[PDB]
Design a protein around this ligand. Structure first.
Ligand SMILES: [Mg+2]
Length: 758
RNA sequence: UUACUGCACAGGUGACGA
DNA sequence: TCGTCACCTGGGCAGTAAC
C-alpha cells in the first residue's frame, strides 16, 4: 500500500537563531525588508517581525534573540525556502515567486511538434510552448503531531505568441475581435488591454478596452489563449493544423503522463539534491527522499474507499457500479412512485430544422435500437413511462438573425401555449450562432426565463448536438434523458450510504461571477443545495431560489436552521440521537461565520440531541499529485499498444497530508479519456479547524460519493453535487435576474421538485 | 446550451493575522 | 492600510462517452 507524491523531503536544521521585534503595524515591513536586503531574511507573523541573518556584515538589528525550532514553527523556514530555492537555481529566471516558477531552458514544443509532423511555416517560430515548473515548499504531517517541510514539483505549459501584430496581419490572419495584452507588464499593471477593432499606423484600435482605446502595435501582443492559438494556426496551416495539435499534444504528453511526470519529478529532485541549499551562508538544507503516502511504521496515511454503488431501489437490493448499467437494467430509483407517466413536452425549434429535430426526437423517445446499444430502448421504456407527447412549436427564425431571435422564440412559445393547455417540460433547440449571444438577445436565457416563469422546466440543445453521428448521439441521449427525467421531478438514482447516526444533512454553496464582457466588473451570485441521509441512500433535497451574494452567510444559516427544524418534525428525533451537519464549498468559511452557524443550529436542534458539525473545503488547484507506480494503466482503446492512465491512483484513494487534510483521487484509469491525458490531480479536502466533527476520511469519502450523484451526466462530476448544482443555480439565477419579465414565483411552487437547473 | 475530461489564457479573489 | 499563504472563476477549444 503505497502512493507516491510529487514532493521531496527537505532536511532542515533542528533549530535556527533569529532576532524578533514587536511591530504591530505591518505597513513598516516592506521598507525594512529593503533596508536589510541581502544580509537578512525577514518575515512578519502574529504582531512581530522575524529576522534571520543570511550573510555576515551590517546593517545592525535590535531585538530579542530566540531559537526557533523547526519541528515546532516550520513556517519560518518554509518561507525562507521559497527564496532559497530561487537563489539555488540562478540560471532559471523566476517567472513568478511563492511558489518559484520558471521555464525550461531549451525545450520548445511547437518547434518539436512541427518537425515531428513534418510541418513548417515562417511564423511558426514566433508561437512558443515552453514547459513551466513550480517548486512549492509545503508543510505536511508524516504522522499526527509531527510536521515536516516538503518541496512539491508541478508542471504546466507556457503558451505565448511573440509575433508582431503587423506580421500576423499580412499573413492573412483576421485579428478583429481578438484579445490583446501588454508585452511588458509595468510593476502592478494589468495585462489585458482589450479587443482589436483595427490597426492603423503603428497603432491598434481597441474595443472593450480596459484602459486607453489605443496602444502601439509594439507594446501589445495577442493573448496566448487557446482561442488565439487555434485562430492563428488554422489560418496559417489548415487543414494541416489538427496534425500539429495532435503532435503538440504528443510533445506535452512527454511531460504530463504518469511515468513521464514521475520521471521529470525524479530529475528535478536529483538536480536540487546535487548541492546543499543555502538557507544562510552557514546553515544548509538538503533535498531528500520522495515523500510517500503509506501505512508503514506509525504512519496511517493511505486508504481506499469502497466503490460507490449507484442505487435504484429503497431495498438496497438493486444496485450497480455504473449509473447507466444500473439505469438500463432496473429503471430509475423512483419509478414505482413517479406521478406523471404521460408527460407533454413542448418542442421549440427553428422551422428550418424540422426534419433534423424529428430524427432527434424519435431517437430520444423511442430509442436507436440494438445497433446503438448505448441508447437502444429510448426514454419511454428507459424510465418506465407510458408515453411522451411532443407539442411542436416551430419558430420562423434564421441563424443570421442576431438581434431578434429571442423575441421570435418567445412569441412563438406564448402563442403555442395559449391554445395548448398544460405542458410538463420543454425542449428548446438552438442555433450555434445564437447560443452565445449577449443575454439581452440570447434565446437560451430568454426561453429558459419564460418557460421557468410559467413553471415549465426545459432541456435545451444546440443544433450541432442534434446532428451528432449516431456513435456520439447515443451517449448524448443518455445524459439528455437523465436530466429530462429529473426536470420532470424524477430521481434517476441515489448512491449508497449505511446510516450510523440518526440524521445527516449536507449543504453546499456555489459561486457564479457574471459580466457581459471582460471589461465589466463581475457580479457575484450564490446558490445552495442540500442532501439528506436516507435509509441506505443519500437524497437530494431542495435548492435556493434567491442568489444573494451580500449576506450569503445569513442564507447558509437560514437554510440549515429551517431544514433542521423540518427534519426533526418529520423524523421525530429521540432524546440522545445524534444529528450531523456537513457544509461544502470551494473556499473555507470565516471563523466568525462558522461560530454563528454552529450557535444557531445548536440552539435550533435543542439540548435533547447531540449535534456534530463539519465545514469542508474542496480544492482542485493545489500543488499535490498522487502517483501509483503499481498501476500499468489500461488499453487506450481496445486493443491498442498505448495505455491510458498509467500510474493513476484508483478512484477512492484517500491520502493523508495532515490532520485536517486529505487528497482524494477521483479519475481512475477507467475514467481517464485518452493516452495523452495527463496524470490526474486529486481533490484536496480540508476540514475547517473549528469543526466539531473531525473525521476527514469519512468526509473525503462522502465528497466522493456526491460526485456520483450528479444527474447532468451518466459519468461523475468533478466536484460534489452540493457545490456543483449550487454553481449551476447561481449562474442561472444571476443571469435571469437581468432578463425582463423573469419571475421566480414558480421555483417553489410548480418547480419545487423539478431539477430545473441541471 | 447532452455531458465528461483536459488544457491555455485572463481576471483577480479568499482565509488568517495585528 | 498592511503582511502572508493560498487558489478560485470565466471564456474558449479539442477529444471522448467507466463493461
Ligand atoms: Mg443542463
Amino acid at each position: 500500500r503505497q502512493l507516491v507524491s510529487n514532493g521531496f523531503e527537505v532536511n532542515l536544521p533542528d533549530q535556527v537563531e533569529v532576532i524578533v521585534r514587536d511591530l504591530p503595524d505591518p505597513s513598516k515591513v516592506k521598507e525594512e525588508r529593503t533596508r536589510l536586503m541581502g544580509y537578512w531574511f525577514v518575515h512578519w507573523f502574529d504582531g512581530k517581525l522575524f529576522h534571520l541573518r543570511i550573510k555576515a556584515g551590517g546593517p545592525n538589528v535590535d531585538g530579542e534573540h530566540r531559537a526557533i525550532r523547526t519541528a515546532e514553527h516550520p513556517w519560518l523556514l518554509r518561507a525562507r525556502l521559497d527564496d532559497a530555492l530561487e537563489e539555488a537555481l540562478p540560471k532559471y529566471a523566476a517567472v513568478k515567486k511563492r511558489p518559484f516558477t520558471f521555464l525550461a531552458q531549451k525545450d520548445e514544443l511547437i518547434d518539436a511538434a512541427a518537425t515531428a509532423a513534418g510541418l513548417s511555416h515562417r511564423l511558426l517560430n514566433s508561437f512558443k510552448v515552453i514547459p513551466r515548473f513550480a517548486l512549492s515548499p509545503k508543510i505536511y504531517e508524516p504522522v499526527d503531531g509531527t510536521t515536516r517541510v516538503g518541496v512539491f514539483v508541478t508542471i504546466g505549459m507556457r503558451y505565448d505568441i511573440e509575433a508582431s501584430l503587423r506580421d500576423l496581419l499580412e499573413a492573412g490572419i483576421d485579428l478583429r475581435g481578438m484579445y490583446v495584452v501588454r508585452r511588458k507588464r509595468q510593476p502592478g499593471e494589468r495585462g489585458l488591454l482589450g479587443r482589436v477593432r483595427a490597426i492603423s499606423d503603428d497603432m491598434v484600435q481597441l474595443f472593450e478596452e480596459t484602459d486607453l482605446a489605443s496602444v502601439n502595435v509594439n507594446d501589445a501582443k495577442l493573448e496566448g489563449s487557446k482561442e488565439n492559438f487555434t485562430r492563428c494556426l488554422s489560418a496559417l496551416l489548415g487543414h494541416n493544423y489538427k496534425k500539429l495539435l495532435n503532435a503538440l499534444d504528443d510533445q506535452e504528453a512527454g511531460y504530463r503522463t504518469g511515468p513521464r511526470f514521475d520521471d521529470a519529478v525524479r530529475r528535478m529532485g536529483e538536480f536540487l539534491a546535487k548541492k546543499p541549499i543555502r538557507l544562510a551562508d552557514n546553515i544548509n538544507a538538503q533535498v531528500g527522499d520522495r515523500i510517500v503516502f503509506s501505512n508503514e511504521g506509525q504512519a496511517r496515511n493511505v486508504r481506499l474507499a469502497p466503490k460507490v454503488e449507484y442505487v435504484f431501489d429503497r431495498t438496497g437490493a438493486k444496485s450497480a457500479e455504473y449509473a447507466w448499467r444500473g439505469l438500463s437494467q432496473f429503471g430509475p430509483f423512483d419509478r414505482p412512485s413517479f406521478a406523471n407517466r404521460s408527460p407533454r413536452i413542448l418542442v421549440v425549434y427553428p422551422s428550418s430544422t424540422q426534419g433534423k429535430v424529428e430524427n432527434f426526437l424519435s431517437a430520444f423517445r423511442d430509442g436507436m435500437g440494438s445497433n446503438y446499444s448505448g441508447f437502444s430502448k429510448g426514454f419511454v421504456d428507459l424510465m418506465g413511462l407510458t408515453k411522451v407527447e411532443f407539442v411542436m412549436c416551430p419558430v420562423e427564425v434564421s441563424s443570421a438573425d442576431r438581434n431578434g431571435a429571442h423575441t421570435k422564440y418567445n412569441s412563438a412559445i406564448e402563442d403555442k401555449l395559449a391554445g395548448a393547455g398544460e405542458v410538463h417540460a420543454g425542449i428548446v433547440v438552438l442555433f450555434e450562432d445564437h447560443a452565445r449571444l449577449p443575454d439581452d438577445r440570447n434565446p437560451y436565457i430568454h426561453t429558459k426565463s419564460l418557460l421557468l416563469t410559467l413553471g415549465v422546466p426545459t432541456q435545451q440543445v444546440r443544433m450541432p448536438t442534434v446532428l451528432l453521428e449516431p456513435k456520439s448521439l447515443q451517449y448524448t441521449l443518455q445524459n439528455f434523458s437523465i436530466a429530462t427525467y429529473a426536470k420532470l421531478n424524477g430521481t434517476p438514482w441515489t448512491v449508497n450510504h449505511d446510516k450510523a447516526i440518526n440524521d445527516e444533512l449536507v449543504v453546499g454553496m456555489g459561486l457564479a461571477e457574471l459580466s457581459g464582457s471582460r471589461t465589466e466588473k463581475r457580479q457575484r451570485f450564490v446558490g445552495i443545495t442540500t442532501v439528506f441521509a436516507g435509509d441506505g441512500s443519500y437524497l437530494l433535497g431542495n435548492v435556493s431560489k434567491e442568489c444573494e451574494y451580500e449576506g450569503y452567510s445569513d442564507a447558509i444559516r437560514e437554510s440549515m436552521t429551517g431544514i433542521l427544524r423540518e427534519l426533526k418534525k418529520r423524523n421525530n428525533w429521540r432524546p440522545g440521537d445524534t444529528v450531523r451537519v456537513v457544509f461544502h464549498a470551494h473556499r473555507p468559511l470565516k471563523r466568525v461565520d462558522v461560530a454563528s452557524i454552529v450557535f444557531e443550529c445548536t440552539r435550533e436542534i435543542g439540548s435533547d440531541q447531540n449535534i456534530q458539525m463539519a465545514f469542508v473545503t474542496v480544492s482542485h488547484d493545489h500543488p499535490f499529485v498522487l502517483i501509483d507506480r503499481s498501476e500499468r494503466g489500461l488499453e487506450a482503446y481496445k486493443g491498442s499498444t498505448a495505455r491510458k492512465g498509467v500510474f493513476a491512483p484508483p478512484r477512492g484513494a484517500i491520502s493523508r497530508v495532515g490532520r485536517l487534510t486529505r487528497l482524494l483521487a477521483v479519475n481512475s484509469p477507467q475514467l481517464i479519456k485518452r493516452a495523452n491525458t495527463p496524470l490526474p490531480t486529486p481533490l484536496l479536502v480540508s476540514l475547517h479547524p473549528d469543526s466539531t466533527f473531525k473525521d476527514v476520511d469519512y468526509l473525503a469519502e462522502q465528497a466522493l460519493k456526491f460526485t456520483s450523484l450528479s444527474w447532468r451526466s451518466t459519468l461523475p462530476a468533478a466536484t460534489p453535487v452540493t457545490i456543483f448544482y449550487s454553481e449551476r443555480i447561481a449562474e442561472l439565477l444571476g443571469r435571469l435576474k437581468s432578463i425582463p419579465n423573469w419571475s421566480s414565483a414558480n421555483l417553489n411552487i410548480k418547480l419545487k421538485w423539478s431539477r430545473w437547473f441541471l
